[PDB]
A paper describes a structure:
Among structural proteins of Sarbecoviruses, spike (S) protein is responsible for receptor binding and mediates membrane fusion between cell and virus to initiate infection. RBDs in SARS-CoV-1 spikes were observed to be in the “up” and “down” positions making the spikes exhibit open and closed conformations, respectively. We introduced these three disulfide bonds in equivalent positions in the SARS-CoV-1 S sequence generating three spike variants: S/x1 (S370C and D967C), S/x2 (G400C and V969C), and S/x3 (D414C and V969C). We determined cryo-EM structures of SARS-CoV-1 S/x1, S/x2, and S/x3 spikes and we identified various previously undetected conformations for SARS-CoV-1 S through classification procedures.
Numbering used by the authors:
A (entry chain A): 554 to 602
B (entry chain B): 31 to 70, 78 to 93, 96 to 132, 155 to 166, 180 to 203, 208 to 235, 250 to 425, 439 to 455, ...
C (entry chain C): 751 to 810, 818 to 823, 832 to 1045
D (entry chain A): 948 to 996
E (entry chain C): 258 to 306
Amino acid sequence: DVSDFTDSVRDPKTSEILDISPCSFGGVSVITPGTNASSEVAVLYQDVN
Amino acid sequence: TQHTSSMRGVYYPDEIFRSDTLYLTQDLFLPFYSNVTGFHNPVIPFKDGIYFAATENVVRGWVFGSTMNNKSQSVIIINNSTNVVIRACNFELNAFNCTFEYISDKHLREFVFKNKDGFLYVYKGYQPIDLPSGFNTLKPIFKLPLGINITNFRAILAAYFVGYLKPTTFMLKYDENGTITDAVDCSQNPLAELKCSVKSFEIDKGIYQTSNFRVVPSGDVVRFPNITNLCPFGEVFNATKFPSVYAWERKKISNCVADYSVLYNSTFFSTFKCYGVSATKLNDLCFSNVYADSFVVKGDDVRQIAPGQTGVIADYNYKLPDDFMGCVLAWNTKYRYLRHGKLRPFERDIQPYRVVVLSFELLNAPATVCGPKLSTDLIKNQCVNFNFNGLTGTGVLTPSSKRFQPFQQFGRDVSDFTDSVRDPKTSEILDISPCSFGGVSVITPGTNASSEVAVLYQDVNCTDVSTAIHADQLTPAWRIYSTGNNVFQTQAGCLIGAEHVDTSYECDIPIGAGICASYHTQKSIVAYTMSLGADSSIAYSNNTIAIPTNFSISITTEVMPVSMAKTSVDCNMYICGDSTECANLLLQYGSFCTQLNRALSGIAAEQDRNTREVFAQVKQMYKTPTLKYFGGFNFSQILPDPLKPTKRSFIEDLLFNKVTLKQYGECLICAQKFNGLTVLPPLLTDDMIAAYTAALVSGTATAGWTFGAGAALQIPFAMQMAYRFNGIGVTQNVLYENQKQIANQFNKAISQIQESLTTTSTALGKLQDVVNQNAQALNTLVKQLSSNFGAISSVLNDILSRLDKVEAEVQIDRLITGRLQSLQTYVTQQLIRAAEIRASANLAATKMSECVLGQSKRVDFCGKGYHLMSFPQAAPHGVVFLHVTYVPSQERNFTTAPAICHEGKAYFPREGVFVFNGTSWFITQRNFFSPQIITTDNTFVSGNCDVVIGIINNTVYD
Amino acid sequence: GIAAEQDRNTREVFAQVKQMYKTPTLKYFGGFNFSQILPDPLKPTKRSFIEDLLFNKVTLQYGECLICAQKFNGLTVLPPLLTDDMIAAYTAALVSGTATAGWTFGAGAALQIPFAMQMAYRFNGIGVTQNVLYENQKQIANQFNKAISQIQESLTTTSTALGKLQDVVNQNAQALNTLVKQLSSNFGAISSVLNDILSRLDKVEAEVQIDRLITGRLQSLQTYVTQQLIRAAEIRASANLAATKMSECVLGQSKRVDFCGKGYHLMSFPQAAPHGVVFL
Amino acid sequence: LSSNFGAISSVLNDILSRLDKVEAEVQIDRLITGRLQSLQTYVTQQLIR
Amino acid sequence: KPTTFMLKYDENGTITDAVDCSQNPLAELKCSVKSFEIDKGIYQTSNFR
Ligand SMILES: *[C@@H]1O[C@H](CO)[C@@H](O)[C@H](O)[C@H]1NC(C)=O
Ligand SMILES: *[C@@H]1O[C@H](CO)[C@@H](O)[C@H](O)[C@H]1NC(C)=O
Ligand SMILES: *[C@@H]1O[C@H](CO)[C@@H](O)[C@H](O)[C@H]1NC(C)=O
Ligand SMILES: *[C@@H]1O[C@H](CO)[C@@H](O)[C@H](O)[C@H]1NC(C)=O
Ligand SMILES: *[C@@H]1O[C@H](CO)[C@@H](O)[C@H](O)[C@H]1NC(C)=O
Ligand SMILES: *[C@@H]1O[C@H](CO)[C@@H](O)[C@H](O)[C@H]1NC(C)=O
Ligand SMILES: *[C@@H]1O[C@H](CO)[C@@H](O)[C@H](O)[C@H]1NC(C)=O
Ligand SMILES: *[C@@H]1O[C@H](CO)[C@@H](O)[C@H](O)[C@H]1NC(C)=O
């Protein structure tokens, strides 16, 4: 690819074409109503299924 | 004979699958449209490569060699029946020595033979059909590790063609599959360079900067002083008696031709370490005079004779400065003990080794000790390479008018540049100037319209450029390019390829200092002086006035950007990836990535605030009426339609199809990339923005201007338009009597906007520019990951798998530094561009509040005319305002008076002007012709008739 | 991008009229003397007399040309798309259209009207009846002419009223001086001269010295470009305000308090300056 | 000011008290480069604000 | 004594005038702004210890 990243490969035994993808990553947000009102939160995991 | 090779001889550069990319590489390619030789068996040269093509089996192999005798090795490739045999022996043209052998087991056959690093690459294609014209791509067959020089070749049996490869740059195009389908040669035209620079095949219209030009030097000027005597290094080195280290001696060496190569071409010296110079470069430099320090020293004290040492000799006997230029020589073959205080450098107080120290004066005076180099003549008024006593450079030489006092050799500037010098032989003062350089612009009318260009050479006199082009001495040396007879001088530079006309038009492509360019009539590229505007004469008179007698309704458009694309980055994935040594090495830099994540996140929050500020200005959601006909004014194309699936209206659909847009990692089912980049979605969807603009239009058409300050109050539309006619200074009867004409003009103008938006003329270029700038910023950021910044590779995994950790530390440090800098540049430019977008959104919010929710009296604020009402429509990343204004059209000349006199009292008009019908005197309003009888109801009385300059006599009715 | 934006600013402020109205032969409209703000046909230049004072007021290396010379540091200054003569032609047509048509050419086509009736309408628009103009016309003409004369004399007095355009000149020059002066530092190398390093040292250590100089000079150029982007933003905001003022105060009569002078606004005139505009 | 940017310490007094000058030049160069970059970033963002 | 001077060179090339940059506050101001005639105002020149 355009940033010198290998994104496919040929298997040296069965000669099958494989695709390479990163496994999931992203940011973590914490939703809180204020620590003086409660001590529970919710977490958003951004941009994944 | 001669033929032409049009777009032939492209091969695959390496062995990597690529698809749907434009790839840009440098190798030995056969240039497009270059000359080939048709042989219809000479010993043909093999300069850097060939392109051999054979149209018919008269050709079965080749012989590649050096002398083509039995005195040098020669590879022979040949094709028997079902065998391809390669041998590399000495041949008579049976085998004396050999080391390589390989046996393995109309229509056009094309081959490329390239030889480098002891390997002979061979490529091969095939195509079924003089040389035909077309494109064909050649695949590799075999490379051979046979290490022989190839300067000649010969075929073996005729109709075959031979080209020649040269090092060029090609921009190859890869299919949806992996195949190369197209290419451009980036040194054929200015236009091909322009296509390679913007990385596209289709160019728009305009002026673009591509590269820079240079004028290359033709000459070489060496000047050295008049010195002939050989230099007495014998008396200093091969000497019988040397003093002790506490009483070292000094010998001055001047006015000699030093050789310095009788010193390092021998193993006679134990140590030879030079500070400030290197030994091989001493034969070109030259010095004022050299001093030699001769003394005798012990074994393990030669280490102690160096800049910055301690001990007994380096503190009480002999000391060197820290800034030492010169060097020391010791070979195999007494001192102070007590002293109050240390010595100052080069000052003395009054197994064995033998040492001599040489110290050079570098050109604070005339040079005398110069090395053995020849001297040439002066070449004035010409770009040359000079060398005046070791002071090199490149530039032109002219006679100068500076008065050097007789101890100065050369002059200086504020950026440490030498710009004047004294000749060592004739002692005349010469000026030094750079050769010509600057930028190169390419002016194009679009590749859809033509394939001709014009070139501007910026900020140069171009008698120089014409002379350097015709002598083939300009660095951007385009092959198929001619100057022509059109050379025109501007203050911008000069323009090659555009002709000068004398008819002025409005500006199309701005070149500079009054000059534009366009594409007129067969067609050509012209160059004129821009005309500033159409011409009129308006005739000032002291007793006439002009008053409109009709009016027209005009609806105009204004496009404003409001927001841009929100972006986040992962530092540890962009800089490092999956590695765990990079993470630990990046921890040493503090919080750079917490800082970067805050900066980008605050930008994204600001984008959402922008949109809420512009659009969320109503507090109640008014429903669109079921009937969209209000007294003749058809509102159908600006309000939503209940029998469509979407919420956008007709003009909004046109606007959304108008702007044409990634593959970075946003969530749309969704994927994500190895570079760590993302685009975050907005808080307000397109449906909620369209609900907002529909509520605003509905509230305008129902309630009017009253919902923007307090509560909404219903009013029929014709009364609303009558009140707005008052607000611009016209009475209400002018609408109530001419209502059908006004309704028809409103409807026809709405239809004209719809048709002009469907016409695919670019009026939404601002939102497109927002899109384009964001994409090019992210493309630069991703492409910066291919650079290595001095490391051996740009890939961390290759560095980590091919090297130990103690070297991987320094290579990963170079990569970490470069990538942190690239990411910091991205964030700074995003902050500046965010400030600009926020100013534009602030203005869009002011226009929604003062031109949609009200009626504004500010001149040209919303429209060109007198404002009546406005409508918001939503666009991708912005808003479109459709301003309805009032234009008065047909004029008429009248005779006017300031006041009239009736009975000795002066009467002035209340609201209007006095005009002369041609028969009698009436009173009318300024913005429409409606004459009325002059009475006491529309006049007021002040004073008598002896003071107003221009008063008349007329009767006033009661 | 900065270079293109500068020409856009100038086009936005000055090119605001459709049609080029010729300056009248007589410059005396009911007692109001316009001789100092319109060009004289008996001179070789297009600028008026007050514009000549303004151009003499501001006192404006690197390559540039007009013979064409170059410098060893690679720095130029590019010429603007609109000449001083074209900006003077713009402001002359604006003054002429005001003195002949008044306010009607910012909305449609121009319509002629005698100057005293135009002033009576402007007095009416600030809330004063028209007889106050028509009965005291001579005094108002005299006060106008005396104020124009004091504007002339206070610009001749060599007071620094034009400090903003001088500040623009000074900031740009000192940025470029710092950029050229950064070429004397060596950033750790043995010398700041590349030719000395390349003529007295072998390849393997010249690589190290040249890498140090390359790093330092890349950092210097990056600082220059970032600060030029921020200053371009300032100049663009100021030009946007000047275009708003030319629309609302030269082509109309503004009711906004203290937008166009201190008082009740009647009428306003544009003059050209180096890199700017002066509103009277 | 607590980061060391690759040097053996974040303190100039420790580097100058426990090391000879020929290595102290290298360590102080690393610290000088890091601190110049930090101060430059502060001035740029103050201009924008 | 080891001092700093600011030397003025002619158009011909001779030294005509100079200031001693450690004699007065004003001479330091002249050396820091690199001119001989100062305008009116308040100017920052150096730092004290
Ligand atoms: C084979 O090569 C050697 C040197 O490589 C040469 O001396 C010898 O003469 C060659 N053989 C014959 C038969 O000439
Ligand atoms: C010179 O003389 C003084 C006093 O005699 C002495 O302190 C000093 O070390 C001597 N040598 C040098 C190099 O100054
Ligand atoms: C140097 O030698 C040249 C001859 O090549 C002679 O013409 C010139 O006068 C000499 N100049 C000096 C200063 O010796
Ligand atoms: C005004 O113009 C319209 C067409 O735009 C025309 O129908 C109408 O008759 C005109 N009015 C007069 C008074 O001429
Ligand atoms: C309003 O305009 C639309 C768009 O042309 C048209 O289809 C519709 O018939 C119009 N409504 C009328 C004439 O009542
Ligand atoms: C003057 O007014 C009368 C009506 O009062 C009108 O018939 C006549 O056309 C007008 N004169 C001219 C020259 O139009
Ligand atoms: C208008 O002003 C000019 C400049 O003072 C003057 O020369 C001219 O006589 C005046 N015009 C008159 C008084 O009509
Ligand atoms: C420079 O030298 C010339 C002699 O050519 C002399 O007339 C002049 O006075 C000198 N000084 C200056 C400041 O020009």
